[model samples]
Target: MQTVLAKIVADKAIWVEARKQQQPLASFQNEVQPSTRHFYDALQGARTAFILECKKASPSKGVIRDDFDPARIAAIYKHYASAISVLTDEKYFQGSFNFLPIVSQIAPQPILCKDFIIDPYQIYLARYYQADACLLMLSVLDDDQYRQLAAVAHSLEMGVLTEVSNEEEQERAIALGAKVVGINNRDLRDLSIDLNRTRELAPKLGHNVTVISESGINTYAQVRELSHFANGFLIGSALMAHDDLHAAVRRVLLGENKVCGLTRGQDAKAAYDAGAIYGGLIFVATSPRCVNVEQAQEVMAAAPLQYVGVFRNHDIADVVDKAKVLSLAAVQLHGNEEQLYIDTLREALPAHVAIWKALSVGETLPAREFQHVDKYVLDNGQGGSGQRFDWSLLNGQSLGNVLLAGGLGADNCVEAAQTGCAGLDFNSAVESQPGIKDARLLASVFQTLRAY
Candidate 1:
């Protein structure tokens, strides 16, 4: 039975032989300079590091970005990414060895030369090309080959990202003394991707190993799900697919907050200035703070943060249409929308766009949970009412995935923080009126939260 990986390995052997003849491994060994930046150290620097990939193509999706510029991409990725991975496999991935050195020069962050390495010659080529690190696929490399290639990389002071798919591969990677292990969600045998692979394999690794979740990681929702298990995420395709690479990178890397009931552009800016990562625009016409599509466009332009469109039992098609038109990061359901509504809306929206269910908490919290909801927003009765709910009701709930909304102002935010909710959502509390945000009040809320 011949798998895609087997074919790739067979092709790699022929390529490696030709490459060796072109430039003998011995000839480039002396020219190899150790990278100034260390990939493993860079991973350790951030809580959930992002190693953004400078990729043009893949075996599964040929020619990922037609308008690809490695150096320019690296420059934008370097701002938010802890490291950069340049796919140097020329045959299948449409990548070039030339990209590694150029990307390294542009992005000071550690450069990972991603390729299929069967022989030690490839490792030397990576080192000579200014690669701080190289990907070593467990599926392609046996024990001896893995050890030999990893040794060559280490001898040149280059980091090795030991790529694994399952528990068996993970065990071999660990037994071979792999310091940095990348759990690839994409199975190379068939090119099918699943984040659950990382979810399953990451916890099995020893604490000493630097765990990285690689492939199929395109959304902040996925990042949040995998963050607890892996130290870093290797992202590609998603960043390259976007026109604004920097903003795309930031959106994938960072989390967000909710400042609901924003109408004007200045109010959205005020929310951003006050350290809110998300600006909520009320789409429900009945709400006093609601913004029309024309007004929302202005708010969107001025707002630097991610936009979450707030809807109240709107038509599923309408919600989907508005979300697509406005390029919303998420949609919050504030009205009496049920599980069926959420599931249907989830199917309609893009995978990157999250669906948040807002629960109006009274004296007691709702035990019901929506399976399709990416996040839960616990608010007072009929959200944007500007009234407080009993914070003590949140006692036993797993608030890690929940956002506490309603009646959160500067004075009570400190108490809200003590409630152990993942985040606090501000609306009427941080505003002078219905839709206008008071910068001073907003600033005070964040300042108090910071001090707390």
Candidate 2:
């Protein structure tokens, strides 16, 4: 298949030769300096890395944002992203090398020059523009060119994001000792996107290698799903198209939706499809919605979202065993588990797994007691009661890290969201039965939440 990328590369070669003639590669070499900001190190930060793109257009979608201010966009991206990817391919992406220096001046985050680099000249030019890193597409470059360009970038004290689309390309990157590999879901040839491409390729790379899941990364759920393997996410079109850039960045970074009391795999899938980042599996034996080990496994298999085991004063050992077996992201304690119990469980559980404590709206725990708890879920009495608590309790208090639960549905979720809580946990309110989730209700509530 003749890909647009072929045409772009062909044009790039011609453009590169002309630029070299105009202002010899030696000119760029003289201007280049060792990068002060390290791109790979920036991605290795404590939390999930977001490499937001500052792109004006693409070959697939022409002119993404009319109000394209590279400096302004880079500033915003620097605030929210681990690194900023500035598209520099002039022909296809409507990007400019001039924008790189402007963006670099304002962006403290490492700036990545997103371009098709088939020659050493491009890498030198990128460093001259103060880029901390440059993109190297494996699909377009052969083994020799890949090696030459990668070496050039590194020698200039710039990192290289070896972009791969398939296993063969990934193998080439791995064999070449590429430390930072970008699993681009978009097939540059035809511009088709399939996120599962990252899902399949990321795990193949070693832990020491930084895996960047690039393209078609639009939602919080997608980030949550891919976070298992990919260290960083490179998002372009979805963010560039959004009206509220700040809110969009916050939504992708902080959006946490947990649909609780899931008894079936299909319900878990429904929740995940509705943009949930966490699936709450009730483990309490007394509850009608409770799932045993076997049922819980099914839920984990079906939904890629982080699983949270909902327990009510279960034995600490039992919680630990269940958490380990299910590979749960978090453990929510609904019963009167004291601080000692929570601290013990916290010590037993893996550090990556979180501990969420359930607090009834009217109830309170001492400030010191929060030592072991990662987050609090504000509820009405015991969970799954489907009764709205007095939201006024959340007024004038710091509820930013707590999830507001109970009676959340399409009708009131909008108001519930306005409470400034970290997220909302939907359970009985969006279910057709005690354990079965109504897909329509789940979708409706998620839609309402996404509006914010």
Candidate 3:
């Protein structure tokens, strides 16, 4: 298949020549150099960085934003302040080299000048324009050009982000000591994008390098999934096309919160957006919200909230397996499991996952089990039945790591939090129907729990 990349490369070659004549390369350095902010150090310093792009269009989708204002967009991008990628490719993307200096001046974080570079003149422009970094695609250049361009960019104090489309190019990028590399999901040949390509390539990468998952990432879930392995994400089309650009930008920014979503079906994401710090998936078959292994994975994949897998008297081995499979933050026991049961489960389960034992109102908490379980969940006799328990019963109790659940809703969440319980959990109260979350209801509960 003929790659659209070939046409872009050929067009760029002629365009570069025309631009080179317009302004000689040496003219860029005519002005005195400003203080340099190293992009490598800034990006590497953060746990996971969001490198947002400010390109107006692409060859595939020729004109993305009809009313394009680089200054306005750059100002908005500065509010988020992680990192920025301003496209300098004029012909296809409708972006100008003017954007590099325009945005970087206002942006607090490092700015990565994104362009199709096959010449040394581009490096001169990158430096003159105040670019903190420059993206060098290995697929566009062979071994020598790749290494040469990178060294030239580095000499000018601009970090080199060597991008690759496949394993061979990836190895060459790494071999050239390009500390920062972008794993582009879109195939350079056909320009057909597959996010799974980023997923598959992640394991082959070493921790020695700072890897950024680039191109075709659509959602916050996709961002977090890749963030688990890669150091950062270079996203463009998805973020730009969002209805509210600010909301989309905030969604992709990862954070390490409850007012929580005790969900069934697929509501983890909605709950998190509604401000829930925790998400619980009930594994008790008797409950309407009970979920199996497959259901757990789907719900867990939806958000970055702390997920709790609820169980009754299910086999401890099954519980452990489900916990490992879904990456649960806590195992919630909702039945009459003895102290020894908790002991055995904790011994087998990963040490990181906590244990929350559900106890009925006025039931004396197992003092012996405190060492075994992480927290005590005080609930009504009818678990997840939306029946409120007497808040007064929790008073004067040795409440150590106890969370108030069962019928805690927007109306009563204020009262529950006032009791000084560790946290609150919402289920039937937040649901519009059985197993369906009502974000409005969840929002109210979360607001109340916020001590507002």
- Which one is best on TM-score? 1
Q: In model 3, what are the clashing residue pairs, if there are any?
A: none
Which digits, one per residue and each the tens of the lDDT, describe model 1 over residues 1-452?
Answer: 99999999899899999988899977777877776778888887536777889888888888878888987997777766788999888889889999887888888899998888888888878888888998998988789888888888888888889999988999998799888899999998989998899888998886898899988876554676677788888889887777767556644553335788888888788777666768898898888888888888999899677899989999999999888889998998989888888888888888889998888776778865678888888888575456788887887777767888878888887777666666678888887777888899988886665441
lDDT of each: 0.82, 0.83, 0.74
- Candidate 2 Cα errors over 4 Å, as ranges: 256-452
Write candidate 2's Cα lDDT for 251-352 as tens digits. Answer: 576466788888888888888777777789888888988889997898789867778998998898889999888889899999988888888999999898
Error of 1 at 439 (Å): 6.9
Model 3 alpha-carbon drift over 4 Å, by segment: 30-35, 254-452
- lDDT, candidate 2, equals 0.83
How much lDDT does candidate 3 score? 0.74
Residues 1-452, candidate 3, lDDT per residue (tens digit)?
Answer: 55788888898899889988998876666672533787888677545776889978887777887767777777877765568899988888988888877887777778888888899888787777778888889889988897788778877777888898888987786677778888999886787888776777766778888888888876444554567668888887766665455545554442112433345434777776765556888888888777778877777777766788888888998999998988988988888888788889999999989898878764443342456777777777556456777777665775546677788777776566566555566777777877788878876765444332
Off by over 4 Å in 1: 21-27, 194-196, 218-221, 244-247, 255-258, 263-278, 281-300, 303-378, 381-452
